[PDB]
Specification:
The PDB classes it as protein transport. This is part of a larger assembly, with chains A (78 residues) and B (51 residues). With 78 residues, chain A is mainly alpha-helical. Chain A has three helices and no strands. Helix content of chain A is 81%, strand content 0%. Chain B has a two-stranded antiparallel ribbon. Chain B starts with a helix and ends with a strand. The chains are: A mainly alpha (78), B alpha+beta (51). At the A-B interface, loops of A face loops of B.
């Protein structure tokens, strides 16, 4: 059975929060790569590449902080 | 007679005490109407799982 913890439940909220960005990025790139000279294409890909950047930085930082809270509590069981 | 009986019965009970009889049985069951695995459906609103 696919097992998921609490950190998994946390990171998953971002993935479901952005419905299709994961796909849109690849679609926009594939368009642009065909015709790297259309400003409407370039402006679109700039916007969606930078939304894709901020998405994953916010994800990994917030997954780290909960690990540090858990390890801090666990260390006091002794 | 009495002494022999009580001795023999106590010692046989201790000897059988060492034997296990909870034989584990393996059964193989086919499913005819459905898939065996869990499945995930990614609704827009939720990640959903069926066990």
């Amino acid at each position: 059975t696919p097992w998921s913890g609490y950190l998994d439940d946390v990171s998953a909220k971002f993935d479901t929060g952005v419905d299709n960005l994961q796909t849109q990025v690849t679609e926009a790139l594939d368009k642009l790569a065909a015709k790297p000279s259309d400003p409407a294409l370039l402006a679109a890909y700039q916007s969606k590449l930078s939304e894709y950047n901020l998405y994953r930085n916010a994800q990994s930082n917030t997954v780290k902080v909960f690990k540090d809270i858990d390890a801090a509590i666990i260390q006091n069981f002794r | 007679y009495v002494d022999m009986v009580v001795n023999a019965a106590t010692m046989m009970d201790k000897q059988n005490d060492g034997i296990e009889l909870g034989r584990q049985k393996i059964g193989v069951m086919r499913l005819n109407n459905t898939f065996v695995g869990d499945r995930t459906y990614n609704l827009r609103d939720q990640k959903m799982v069926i066990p």
